[PDB]
């Protein structure tokens, strides 16, 4: 049973990334090595982020929920945007290709580092927990979030982006960076159940995706 | 001395050291 | 002729072995030469002969 549950969790986490990779046409462009390079960039950025946090921020000893600490972590999450920009600048191609390569490589690298080991050790345990399935869904939400963030970074980095659109892009980037902190604060404040928290994260990511898509379409059409 | 003999001598020495350890354990026990 | 072609590997191996024996004997004679001046003249000639062979090989390869 434990192997079957682990296989189901692994399939749910992994297959959406493969489907996105095949359907987006990245396989046609032989982008796999570019995605691997993006993942290496993610590993480098995450190491720099951990080093920055340890060097500059002492751990708060207050028992109460560390609102300052979570806000600081979200502020450090800007490094992920910088890394995504570096990956897109390093990668040549159409804007959609750059966005998809950066998002897919970053999300896959995060999935491998953060969820595979917990899936491997925990999901093979005797005890059944919904948390592994929730984490597998959360990886798909992270993948969508990274796609949105990469699209936003590409739009802001566009030389031709009109000044009217620029504040909207900056606001969307701000919301994307602070989304994790806001969601954790909201879940703590409302004592939300794990399923409700996952649903709320999905809804927020979907709304961000829809707004980013609408802005992207408007920006492309304004130049078409 | 050929290279193959040198290798054989090295392997025999290693095996002898393992045998000596085993014999020492048997003598102690 | 077909048989000779079949036997071709053996003949090359034998020819190489007889050269190894001839080279070994030449080295032994040089080692066994009591006079240091003679030994040095023979050794210098042997090394220069090898060098000429190496240069000739490099020219053929070029």
């Amino acid at each position: 049973m434990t192997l079957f549950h682990f296989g189901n969790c692994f399939a749910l986490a992994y297959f959406p990334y493969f489907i996105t990779y095949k359907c987006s046409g990245l396989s046609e462009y032989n982008a796999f090595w570019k995605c691997v390079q993006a993942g290496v960039t993610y590993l480098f950025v995450q190491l720099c982020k951990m080093l920055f946090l340890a060097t500059f921020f002492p751990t708060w000893e207050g028992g109460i929920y560390d609102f300052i600490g979570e806000f600081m972590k979200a502020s450090v999450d800007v490094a992920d945007l910088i890394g995504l920009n570096l990956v897109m600048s390093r990668n040549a191609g159409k804007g959609e290709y750059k966005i998809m390569v950066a998002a897919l490589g970053w999300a896959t690298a995060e999935l491998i580092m953060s969820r595979c080991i917990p899936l491997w050790v925990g999901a093979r345990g005797i005890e059944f927990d919904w948390k592994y399935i929730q984490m597998s869904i959360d990886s798909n939400i992270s993948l969508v979030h990274y796609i949105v963030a990469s699209a936003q970074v590409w739009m802001i980095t566009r030389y031709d982006l009109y000044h009217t659109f620029r504040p909207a892009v900056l606001l969307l980037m701000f919301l994307s960076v602070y989304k994790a902190f806001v969601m954790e604060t909201f879940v703590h404040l409302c004592s939300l159940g794990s399923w409700t928290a996952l649903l709320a994260r999905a809804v927020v990511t979907g709304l961000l995706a829809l707004s980013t898509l609408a802005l992207y379409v408007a920006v492309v059409n304004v130049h078409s | 001395v050929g290279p193959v003999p040198v290798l054989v001598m090295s392997l025999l020495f290693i095996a002898s050291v393992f045998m000596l350890h085993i014999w020492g354990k048997y003598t102690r026990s | 002729e077909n048989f000779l072609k079949l036997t071709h590997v053996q003949r090359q191996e034998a020819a190489q072995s007889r050269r190894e024996e001839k080279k070994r004997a030449e080295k032994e004679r040089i080692m066994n030469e009591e006079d240091p001046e003679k030994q040095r003249r023979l050794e210098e000639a042997a090394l220069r002969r090898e060098q000429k062979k190496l240069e000739k090989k490099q020219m053929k390869m070029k």
């Binding site: 080093l51 002492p58 | 001395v1 290279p3 392997l11 020495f13 290693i14 393992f18 | 030994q39 060098q51």
Partner: protein, 465 residues
């Protein structure tokens, strides 16, 4: 009217085993296979413990030295390569000093190589007996004569095996030099082991992973204070730190960057028009050999000092050479020289120690730089790598500098090669000191040795390919 030293040693040389040189040129893949097999045997010997050692938690005085010498305590490789390096250093120094005149005849060269091997074996026997008699494995009376003899025989056989393997690789069965490969592998293994070791060491507060990366992951997973756990992993006082690993990576990159520095001299074939080559005079012209010679000399000095202190306590000469004290300051026992020349020769453990004892740090830095420069200059003359010898090699290769006669080539080479050697040795010493102060895992000397050995092996591999 001195009877030839080689002639005196000639009867003993017959007893010495000598590997037959290959009758046929070995294929490149076969050479790779031979090198792999020899390395695997060396690693197994490095891991096999010696028989009959009594388990003494006695201080390791030589822990820094063992990494350079490819030696593991309590194993068949306890002596490591130290006898072979010492015999090579002594025999080469004697030849350079002209105390022993080596004739150009093959008999004289063969005797010279046999004498060097014989000295290496004699040193191996002497050092093994010395180590057994010094109580490094326990009191000789408690161990008993039979165990002491068995250990001495095992060490002698292990040293002989290492010497044969090195001869096998040097004679062209394998790639490059066995001593270099063994040193590089030992250093790489030690650094990788410290980075990724899954062993748990019971620090007084808790069980802590030895491996810096594994400890970092375990602490991050198990600790609510992820930032504090990360900081502890970065600045751990008792175990290899992530900061130390980063320092090692930085040093490794810096060393490679300096390694790339070269002066290209344009050479043309005199015989054939249009063939342009460059003769690269590297910044590290003399290679790791100045480091190896300096470390071997210092290692021998430490061994002699520790023996003299153990056997003849309180003599003024013994105190001048070195006084050893075993400092069990919340750590595995380490014997540090607290007085004498050995103290000045020892590397300071930290910037804090450098601040506490500035004179010692300055003396150590000056000694390392001066010794490396001196050894580099002497090595060029002994090695036959002088500008005259390089010009002779170019003439043999029919390579002539454009517009310059072969005699002119010697003058041009003589302008750069001595300067390159001395400056490279000084730079190498400075890099070693900087890496030691930075606390790089595997030692500054070790990291330099590994990087340069790997680079020279890669160059050999590319040239053969």
């Amino acid at each position: 009217m001195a009877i030839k030293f080689l002639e005196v040693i000639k009867p003993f040389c017959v007893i010495l085993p000598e590997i037959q040189k290959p009758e046929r040129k070995i294929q490149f893949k076969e050479k790779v296979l031979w090198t792999a097999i020899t390395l695997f045997i060396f690693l197994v010997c490095c891991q096999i413990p010696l028989f009959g050692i009594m388990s003494s938690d006695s201080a390791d005085p030589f822990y820094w030295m063992r990494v350079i010498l490819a030696s593991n305590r309590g194993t068949l490789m306890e002596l490591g390569i130290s006898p072979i390096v010492t015999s090579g250093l002594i025999m080469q120094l004697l030849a350079g000093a002209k105390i022993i005149e080596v004739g150009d005849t093959p008999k004289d060269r063969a005797l010279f190589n046999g004498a060097q091997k014989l000295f290496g074996m004699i040193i191996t026997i002497g050092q093994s007996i010395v180590y057994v008699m010094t109580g490094m494995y326990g009191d000789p009376s408690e161990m008993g004569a039979g165990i002491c003899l068995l250990i001495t025989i095992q060490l002698f056989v292990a040293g002989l095996i290492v010497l044969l393997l090195d001869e096998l690789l040097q004679k062209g069965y394998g790639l490059g030099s066995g001593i270099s490969l063994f040193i590089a592998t030992n250093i790489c293994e030690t650094i990788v082991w410290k980075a990724f070791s899954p062993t748990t060491v019971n620090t007084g507060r808790g069980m802590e992973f030895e491996g810096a990366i594994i400890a970092l992951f375990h602490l991050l997973a198990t600790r609510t204070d992820k930032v504090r756990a990360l900081r502890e992993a970065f600045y751990r006082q008792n175990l290899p730190n992530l900061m130390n690993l980063i320092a090692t990576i930085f040093v490794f990159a810096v060393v490679i960057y300096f390694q790339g520095f070269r002066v290209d001299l344009p050479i043309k074939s005199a015989r054939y028009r249009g063939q342009y080559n460059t003769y690269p005079i590297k910044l590290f012209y003399t290679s790791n050999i100045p480091i190896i010679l300096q470390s071997a000399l210092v290692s021998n000095l430490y061994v002699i000092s520790q023996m003299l202190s153990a056997r003849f306590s309180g003599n003024l000469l013994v105190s001048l050479l070195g006084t050893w004290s075993d400092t069990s300051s919340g750590g595995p026992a380490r014997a540090y020289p607290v007085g004498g020349l050995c103290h000045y020769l020892s590397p300071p453990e930290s910037f804090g120690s450098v601040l506490e004892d500035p004179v010692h740090a300055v003396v150590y830095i000056v000694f390392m730089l001066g010794s490396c420069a001196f050894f580099s200059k002497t090595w060029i003359e002994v090695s036959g790598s002088s500008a005259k010898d390089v010009a002779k090699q170019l003439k043999e290769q029919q390579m002539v500098m454009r517009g310059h006669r072969e005699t002119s080539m010697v003058h041009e080479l003589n302008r750069y090669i001595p300067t390159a050697a001395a400056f490279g040795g000084l730079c190498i010493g400075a890099l070693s000191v900087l890496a030691d102060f930075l606390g790089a895992i595997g030692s500054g000397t070790g990291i330099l040795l590994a990087v340069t050995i790997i680079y020279q092996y890669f160059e050999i591999f590319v040239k053969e390919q």
